[PDB]
């Protein structure tokens, strides 16, 4: 019957900033405290065990401290490769992982590189046309995609997704798909993707003519 509290649930910081995560146990766990890094897509990686024993191969900017019920994880100087959810683990009375801390990076504005892709010949033979818009390496993550078919704004026939933050440049990338039946696709000629973002002075329109 042991409880744990990991604070905070999420934090934002700039590259070079000091980042601190704390953990509080309901009973003394006698330094049996470990810290794990989990980057997106990948599996957890041990950074520090037994409160302050830094695993060989882990940079010196990472450190742990504490005793009793109170423990602290520090990143002395935040790096772009440090974007991850961090977990604390108590291993004295059985095993309890913390709720986790998502560490996101604050960086300078970066406008997206916009690209438009027509549906392939292979796909058209099947009777469905998927038009794709790509917004590449932008910051902040908020961006708008407006699909235009012969200057008419589209609604209800689009789906989009954004990537996790990048571990090198700290940007995001977005992909939007406009889906139509081959019949409807053949009824129009100009297919356009209009992108609005904080980093752009004026919206960017990427287009192609069917044929």
């Amino acid at each position: 019957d042991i409880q744990m509290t990991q604070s905070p649930s999420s934090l934002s910081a700039s590259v070079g900033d000091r980042v601190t995560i704390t953990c509080k146990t309901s009973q003394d766990i006698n330094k049996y405290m470990a810290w794990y890094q989990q980057t997106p897509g990948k599996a957890p990686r041990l950074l520090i065990h037994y409160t302050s024993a830094l695993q060989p191969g882990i940079p010196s900017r990472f450190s742990g401290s504490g005793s009793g019920r109170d423990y602290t994880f520090t990143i002395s100087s935040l790096q772009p490769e440090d974007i991850a959810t961090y977990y604390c683990l108590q291993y004295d009375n059985l095993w309890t992982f913390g709720q986790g801390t998502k560490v996101e990076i604050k960086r300078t504005v970066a406008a997206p590189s916009v690209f438009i892709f027509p549906p392939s010949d292979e796909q058209l033979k099947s009777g469905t046309a998927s038009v794709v818009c790509l917004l590449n390496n932008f910051y902040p993550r908020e961006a708008k995609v407006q699909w235009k078919v012969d200057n008419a704004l589209q609604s209800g026939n689009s789906q989009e997704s954004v990537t996790e933050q990048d571990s090198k440049d700290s940007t995001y990338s977005l992909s939007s798909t406009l889906t139509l039946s081959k019949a409807d696709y053949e009824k129009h000629k100009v297919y356009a993707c209009e992108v609005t973002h904080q980093g752009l002075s004026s919206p960017v329109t990427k287009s192609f003519n069917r044929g």
Binding site: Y32, A34, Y36, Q38, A43, P44, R45, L46, H49, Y50, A53, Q55, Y87, L89, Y91, L94, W95, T96, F97, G98, Q99, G100, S113, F115, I116, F117, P118, P119, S120, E122, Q123, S126, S130, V132, L134, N136, Q159, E160, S161, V162, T163, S173, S175, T177, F208, N209
Partner: protein, 218 residues
């Protein structure tokens, strides 16, 4: 040298049972403890249990006790986890991890983790994806990609030029179509100068349907 390889992604119906394998190599499995930890996406790591493979002694979490059974086949150097009476709530990535000894401190620590195993809980049919090229119509940089469409369940892996091309690559999270099938895109930015002097192929693998497609993009 020290590695922990897990069995592939499973899709099991509710009420059914699931067994996950964890192959240990680069060390003696009888010298470390093997833990099972689960994780739903955007949620916490939940410890399920531990096994000492040398004596077969198991310690579970009371919320997982009864439904979880952790065993070990020491000859095969593998650890198993069986989860009976599956519910929709049990859908998560299941990880195995080793807890090895540290001589310079006189302690054990959960130090290495496997890649994980996605256990999808569903009655829906497995469906292989269709791979469509993403190429521009007719700038210093150009973009190429693959549209991996109409598959079930997750996941699909996308690599470029058999792993040679990684810089400038973006494999996007899947979107859920009205059909109940997933669609995802993978893209790469390359210099416009090389769109003739170099070949670009996406390598799509959807192991649940035994699908491995290598689509060249031009």
């Amino acid at each position: 040298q020290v590695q922990l390889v897990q069995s592939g992604a499973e899709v099991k119906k509710p009420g059914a049972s699931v067994k996950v394998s964890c192959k240990a190599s680069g060390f003696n499995i009888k010298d470390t403890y093997i833990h099972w930890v689960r994780q739903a996406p955007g949620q916490r790591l939940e410890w399920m249990g531990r096994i000492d493979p040398a004596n077969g002694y198991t310690k579970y979490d009371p919320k997982f006790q009864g439904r979880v059974t952790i065993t070990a086949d020491t000859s095969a150097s593998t650890a198993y986890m069986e989860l009976s009476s599956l519910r929709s709530e049990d859908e998560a990535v299941y990880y195995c991890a080793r807890e090895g000894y540290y001589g310079n401190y006189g302690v054990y620590a959960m130090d290495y983790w496997g890649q994980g195993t996605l256990v999808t809980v569903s009655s829906a049919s497995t469906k292989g994806p269709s791979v469509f090229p993403l190429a521009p119509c007719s700038e210093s940089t150009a973009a190429l990609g693959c549209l991996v469409k109409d598959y079930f369940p997750e996941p699909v892996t996308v690599s470029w030029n058999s792993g040679a091309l990684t810089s400038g690559v973006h494999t996007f999270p899947a979107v859920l179509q009205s059909s109940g099938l997933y669609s995802l895109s993978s893209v790469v930015t390359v210099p416009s100068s090389s769109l003739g002097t170099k070949t670009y192929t996406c390598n799509v693998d959807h192991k649940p349907s035994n699908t491995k497609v290598d689509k060249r993009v031009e």
